[PDB]
PDB file of C-alpha atoms in Angstrom:
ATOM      1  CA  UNK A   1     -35.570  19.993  12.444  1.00 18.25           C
ATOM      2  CA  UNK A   2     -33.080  22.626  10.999  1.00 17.47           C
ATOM      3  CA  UNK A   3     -30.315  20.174  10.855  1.00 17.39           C
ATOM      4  CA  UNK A   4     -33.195  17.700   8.767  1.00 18.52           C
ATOM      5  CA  UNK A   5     -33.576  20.636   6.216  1.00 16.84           C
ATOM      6  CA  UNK A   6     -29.692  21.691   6.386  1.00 17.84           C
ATOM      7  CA  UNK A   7     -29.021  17.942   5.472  1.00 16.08           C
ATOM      8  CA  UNK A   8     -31.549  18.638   2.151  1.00 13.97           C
ATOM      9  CA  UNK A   9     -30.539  21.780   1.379  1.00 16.24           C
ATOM     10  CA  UNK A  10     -27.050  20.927   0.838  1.00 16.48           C
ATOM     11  CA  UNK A  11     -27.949  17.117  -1.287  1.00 13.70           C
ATOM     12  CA  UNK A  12     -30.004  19.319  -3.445  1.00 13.59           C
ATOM     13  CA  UNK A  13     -27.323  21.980  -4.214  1.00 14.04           C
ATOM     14  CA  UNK A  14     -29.470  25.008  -2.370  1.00 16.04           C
ATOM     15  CA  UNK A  15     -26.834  27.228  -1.950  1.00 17.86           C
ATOM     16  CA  UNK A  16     -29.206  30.198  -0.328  1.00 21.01           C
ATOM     17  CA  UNK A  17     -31.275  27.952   1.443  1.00 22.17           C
ATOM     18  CA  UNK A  18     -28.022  26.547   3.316  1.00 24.37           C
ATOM     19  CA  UNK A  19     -26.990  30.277   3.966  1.00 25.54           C
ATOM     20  CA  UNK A  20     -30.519  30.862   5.509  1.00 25.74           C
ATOM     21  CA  UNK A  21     -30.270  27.740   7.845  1.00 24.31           C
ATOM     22  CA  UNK A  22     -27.038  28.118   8.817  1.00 25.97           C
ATOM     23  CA  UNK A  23     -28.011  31.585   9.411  1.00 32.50           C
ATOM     24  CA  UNK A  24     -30.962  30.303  11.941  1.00 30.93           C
ATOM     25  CA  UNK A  25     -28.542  28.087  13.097  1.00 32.88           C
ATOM     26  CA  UNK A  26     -29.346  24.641  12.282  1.00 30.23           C
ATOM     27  CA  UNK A  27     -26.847  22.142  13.258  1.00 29.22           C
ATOM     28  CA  UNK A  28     -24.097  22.238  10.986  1.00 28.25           C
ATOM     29  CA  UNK A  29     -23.481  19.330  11.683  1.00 29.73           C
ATOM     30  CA  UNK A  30     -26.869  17.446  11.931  1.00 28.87           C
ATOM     31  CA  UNK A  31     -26.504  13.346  11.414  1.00 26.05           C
ATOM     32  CA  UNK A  32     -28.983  11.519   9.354  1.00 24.42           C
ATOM     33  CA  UNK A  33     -29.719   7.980   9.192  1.00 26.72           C
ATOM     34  CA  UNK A  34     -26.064   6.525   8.544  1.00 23.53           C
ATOM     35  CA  UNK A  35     -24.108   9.602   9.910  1.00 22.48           C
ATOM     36  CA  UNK A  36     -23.738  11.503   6.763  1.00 22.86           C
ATOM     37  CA  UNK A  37     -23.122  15.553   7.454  1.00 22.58           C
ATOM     38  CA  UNK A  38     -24.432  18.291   5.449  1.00 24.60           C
ATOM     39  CA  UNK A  39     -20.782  18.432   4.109  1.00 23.55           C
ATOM     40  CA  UNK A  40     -20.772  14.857   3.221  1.00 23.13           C
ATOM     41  CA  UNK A  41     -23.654  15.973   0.934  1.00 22.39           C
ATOM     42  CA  UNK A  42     -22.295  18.665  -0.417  1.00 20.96           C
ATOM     43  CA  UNK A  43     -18.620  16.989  -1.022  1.00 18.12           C
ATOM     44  CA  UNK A  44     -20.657  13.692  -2.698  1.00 20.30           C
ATOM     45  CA  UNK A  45     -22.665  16.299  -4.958  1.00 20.01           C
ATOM     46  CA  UNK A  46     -19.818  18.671  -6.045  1.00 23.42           C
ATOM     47  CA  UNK A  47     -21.327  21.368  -4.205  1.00 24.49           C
ATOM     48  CA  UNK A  48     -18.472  23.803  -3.834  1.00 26.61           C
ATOM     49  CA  UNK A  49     -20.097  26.777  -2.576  1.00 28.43           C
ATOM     50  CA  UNK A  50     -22.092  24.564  -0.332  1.00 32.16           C
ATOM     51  CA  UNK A  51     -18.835  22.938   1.248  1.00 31.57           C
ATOM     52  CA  UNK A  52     -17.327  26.516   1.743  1.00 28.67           C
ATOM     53  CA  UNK A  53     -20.539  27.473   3.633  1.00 28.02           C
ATOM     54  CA  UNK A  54     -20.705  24.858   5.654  1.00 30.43           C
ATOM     55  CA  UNK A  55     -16.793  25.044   6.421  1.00 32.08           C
ATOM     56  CA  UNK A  56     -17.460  28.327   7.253  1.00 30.70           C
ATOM     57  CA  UNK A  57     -19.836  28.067   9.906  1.00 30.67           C
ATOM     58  CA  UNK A  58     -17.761  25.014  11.584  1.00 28.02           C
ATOM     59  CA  UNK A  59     -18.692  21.823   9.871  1.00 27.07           C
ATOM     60  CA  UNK A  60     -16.470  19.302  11.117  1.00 30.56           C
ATOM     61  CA  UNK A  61     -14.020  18.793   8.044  1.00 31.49           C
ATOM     62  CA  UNK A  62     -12.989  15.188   9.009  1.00 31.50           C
ATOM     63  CA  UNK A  63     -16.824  13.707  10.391  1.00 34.37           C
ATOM     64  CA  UNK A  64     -17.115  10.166   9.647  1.00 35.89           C
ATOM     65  CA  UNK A  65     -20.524   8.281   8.653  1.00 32.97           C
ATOM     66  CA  UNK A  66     -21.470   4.963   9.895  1.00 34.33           C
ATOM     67  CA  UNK A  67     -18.625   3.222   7.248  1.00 33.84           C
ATOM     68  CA  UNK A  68     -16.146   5.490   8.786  1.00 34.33           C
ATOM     69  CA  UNK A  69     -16.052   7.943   5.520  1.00 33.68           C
ATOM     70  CA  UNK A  70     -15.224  11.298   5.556  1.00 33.10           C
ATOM     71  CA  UNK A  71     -16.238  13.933   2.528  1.00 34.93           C
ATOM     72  CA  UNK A  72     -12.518  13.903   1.442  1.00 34.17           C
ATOM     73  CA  UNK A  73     -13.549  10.431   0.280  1.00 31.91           C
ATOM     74  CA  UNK A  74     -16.791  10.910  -0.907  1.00 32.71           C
ATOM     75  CA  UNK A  75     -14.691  13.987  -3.180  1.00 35.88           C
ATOM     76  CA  UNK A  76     -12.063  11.971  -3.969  1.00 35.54           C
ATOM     77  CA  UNK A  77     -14.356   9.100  -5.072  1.00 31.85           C
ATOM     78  CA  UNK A  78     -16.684  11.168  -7.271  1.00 32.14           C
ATOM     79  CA  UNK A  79     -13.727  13.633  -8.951  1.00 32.84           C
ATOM     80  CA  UNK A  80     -14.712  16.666  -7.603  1.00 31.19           C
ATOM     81  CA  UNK A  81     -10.547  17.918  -7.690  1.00 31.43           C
ATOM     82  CA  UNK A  82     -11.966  21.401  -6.721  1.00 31.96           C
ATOM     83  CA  UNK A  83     -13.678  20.140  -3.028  1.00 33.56           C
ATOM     84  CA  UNK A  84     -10.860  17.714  -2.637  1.00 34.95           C
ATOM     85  CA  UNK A  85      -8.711  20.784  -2.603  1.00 33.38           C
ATOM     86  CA  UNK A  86     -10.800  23.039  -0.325  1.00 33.31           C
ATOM     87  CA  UNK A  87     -11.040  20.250   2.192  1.00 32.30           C
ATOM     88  CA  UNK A  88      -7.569  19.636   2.227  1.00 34.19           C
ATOM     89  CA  UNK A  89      -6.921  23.070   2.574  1.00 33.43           C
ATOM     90  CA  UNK A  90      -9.747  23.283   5.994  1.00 30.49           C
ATOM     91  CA  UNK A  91      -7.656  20.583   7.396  1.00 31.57           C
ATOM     92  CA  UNK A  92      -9.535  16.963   6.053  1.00 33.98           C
ATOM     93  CA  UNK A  93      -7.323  14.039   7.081  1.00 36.55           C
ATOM     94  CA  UNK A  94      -5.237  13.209   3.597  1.00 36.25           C
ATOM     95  CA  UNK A  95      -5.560   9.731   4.950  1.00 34.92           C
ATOM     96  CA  UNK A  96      -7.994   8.732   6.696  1.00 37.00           C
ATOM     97  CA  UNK A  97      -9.058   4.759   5.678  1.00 37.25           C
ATOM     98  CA  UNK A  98     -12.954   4.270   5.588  1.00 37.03           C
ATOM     99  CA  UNK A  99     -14.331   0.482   6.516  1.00 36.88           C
ATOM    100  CA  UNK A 100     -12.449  -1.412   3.854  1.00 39.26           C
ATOM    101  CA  UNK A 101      -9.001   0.561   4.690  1.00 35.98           C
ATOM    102  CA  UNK A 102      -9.306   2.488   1.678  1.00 36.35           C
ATOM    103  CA  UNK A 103      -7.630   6.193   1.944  1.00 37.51           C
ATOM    104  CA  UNK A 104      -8.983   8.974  -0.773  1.00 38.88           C
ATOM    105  CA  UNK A 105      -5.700   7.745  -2.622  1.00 41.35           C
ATOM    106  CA  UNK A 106      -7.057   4.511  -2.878  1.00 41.54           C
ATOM    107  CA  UNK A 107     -10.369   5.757  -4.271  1.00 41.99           C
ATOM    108  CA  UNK A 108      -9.042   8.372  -6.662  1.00 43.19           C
ATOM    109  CA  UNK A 109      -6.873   5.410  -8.007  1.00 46.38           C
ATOM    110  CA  UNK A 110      -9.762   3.078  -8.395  1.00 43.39           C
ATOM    111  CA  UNK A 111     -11.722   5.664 -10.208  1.00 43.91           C
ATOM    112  CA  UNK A 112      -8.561   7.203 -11.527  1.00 42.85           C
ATOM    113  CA  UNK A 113      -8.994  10.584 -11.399  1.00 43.41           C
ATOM    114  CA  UNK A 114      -5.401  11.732 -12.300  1.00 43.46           C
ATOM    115  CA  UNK A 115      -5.327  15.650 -10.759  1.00 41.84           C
ATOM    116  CA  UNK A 116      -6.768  14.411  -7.355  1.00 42.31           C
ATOM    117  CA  UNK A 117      -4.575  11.739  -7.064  1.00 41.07           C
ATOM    118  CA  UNK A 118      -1.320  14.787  -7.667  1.00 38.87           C
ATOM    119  CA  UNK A 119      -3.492  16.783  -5.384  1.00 38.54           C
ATOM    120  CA  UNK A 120      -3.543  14.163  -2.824  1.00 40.79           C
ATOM    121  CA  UNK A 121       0.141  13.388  -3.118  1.00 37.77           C
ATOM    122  CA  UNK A 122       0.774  16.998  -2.860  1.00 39.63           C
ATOM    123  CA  UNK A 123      -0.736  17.128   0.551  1.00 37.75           C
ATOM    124  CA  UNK A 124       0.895  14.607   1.821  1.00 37.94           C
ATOM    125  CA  UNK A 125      -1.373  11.446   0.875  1.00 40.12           C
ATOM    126  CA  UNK A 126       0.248   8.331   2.523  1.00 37.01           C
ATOM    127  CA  UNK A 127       1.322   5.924  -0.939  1.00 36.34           C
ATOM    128  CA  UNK A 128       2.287   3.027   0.927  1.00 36.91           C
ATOM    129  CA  UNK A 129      -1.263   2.576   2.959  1.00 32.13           C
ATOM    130  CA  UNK A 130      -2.706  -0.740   2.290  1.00 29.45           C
ATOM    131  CA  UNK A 131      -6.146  -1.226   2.616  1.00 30.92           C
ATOM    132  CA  UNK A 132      -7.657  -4.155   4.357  1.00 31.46           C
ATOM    133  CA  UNK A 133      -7.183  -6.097   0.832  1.00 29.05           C
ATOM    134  CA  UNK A 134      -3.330  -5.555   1.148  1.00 29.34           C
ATOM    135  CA  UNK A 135      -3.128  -3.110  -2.040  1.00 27.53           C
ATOM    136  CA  UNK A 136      -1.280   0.442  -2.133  1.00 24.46           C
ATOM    137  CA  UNK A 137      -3.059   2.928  -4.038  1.00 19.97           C
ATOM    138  CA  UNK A 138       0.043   1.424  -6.950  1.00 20.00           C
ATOM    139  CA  UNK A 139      -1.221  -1.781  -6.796  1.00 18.47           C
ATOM    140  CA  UNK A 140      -4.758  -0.773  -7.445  1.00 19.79           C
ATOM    141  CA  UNK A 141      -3.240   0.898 -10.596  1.00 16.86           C
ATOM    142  CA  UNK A 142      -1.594  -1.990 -11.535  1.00 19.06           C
ATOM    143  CA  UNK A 143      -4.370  -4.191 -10.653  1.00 16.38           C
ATOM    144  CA  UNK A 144      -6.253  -1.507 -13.154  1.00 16.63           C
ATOM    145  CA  UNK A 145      -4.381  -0.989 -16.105  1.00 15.90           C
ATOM    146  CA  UNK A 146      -4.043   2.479 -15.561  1.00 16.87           C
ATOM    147  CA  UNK A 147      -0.538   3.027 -16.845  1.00 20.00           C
ATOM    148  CA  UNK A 148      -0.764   6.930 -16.538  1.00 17.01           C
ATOM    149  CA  UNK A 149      -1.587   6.347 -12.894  1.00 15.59           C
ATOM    150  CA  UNK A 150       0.712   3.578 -12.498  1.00 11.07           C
ATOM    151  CA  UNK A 151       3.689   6.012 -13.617  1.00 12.40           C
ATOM    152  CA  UNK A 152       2.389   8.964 -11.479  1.00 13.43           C
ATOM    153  CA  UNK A 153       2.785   6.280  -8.792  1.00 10.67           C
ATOM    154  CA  UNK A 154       6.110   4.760  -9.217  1.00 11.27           C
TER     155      UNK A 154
END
């Protein structure tokens, strides 16, 4: 399929090869096994020019996979500050809560990366979501230590 190779193209970081397919028009928002999106790819592996691509030709900014997360998270997760901000700015969902409740707050906080976590607050990230545990994005920084964090928080 084009959508199997679009999905490959963008996990390996091929920016021209993505330009190509897209340019066929593959699916630009093929599925694979667990629902993951060429931009889910591309936001997990820190491929900017990838995301913009794909964002360009009409990915779906706020597609979920099978756990109900969206590339903001996968971004926001792995501390890629610079696709956190170009999804925000294409319209991602600040706070959307994958399977365990957690919002990209709660997973820049867990990992705590400190200028996605402004970013995210910037944009209007929801600090007093609790996740299916019962934390805030706070209490995970209290829960971690992270003082820094803890003081950006409170």
């Amino acid at each position: 399929d084009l959508g199997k190779k679009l999905l490959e193209a963008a996990r390996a970081g091929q920016d021209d090869e993505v330009r190509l397919l897209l340019e066929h028009g593959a699916d630009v928002n093929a599925r694979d096994s667990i629902g993951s999106t060429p931009l889910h790819l591309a936001a997990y592996y820190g491929h900017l020019e990838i995301v913009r691509l794909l964002l360009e030709h009409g990915a779906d900014v706020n597609a979920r996979d099978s756990t109900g997360t969206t590339p903001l998270h996968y971004a926001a997760r792995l501390g890629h500050l610079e696709i956190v901000r170009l999804l925000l700015e294409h319209g991602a969902d600040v706070n959307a809560r994958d399977a365990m409740g957690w919002t990209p707050l709660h997973l820049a906080a867990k990992k705590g990366h400190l200028e996605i976590v402004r970013l995210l607050l910037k944009h209007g990230a929801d600090v007093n979501a609790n996740d299916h545990f019962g934390k805030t994005a706070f209490d995970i920084s209290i829960d971690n230590g992270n003082e820094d964090l803890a003081e950006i928080l409170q």
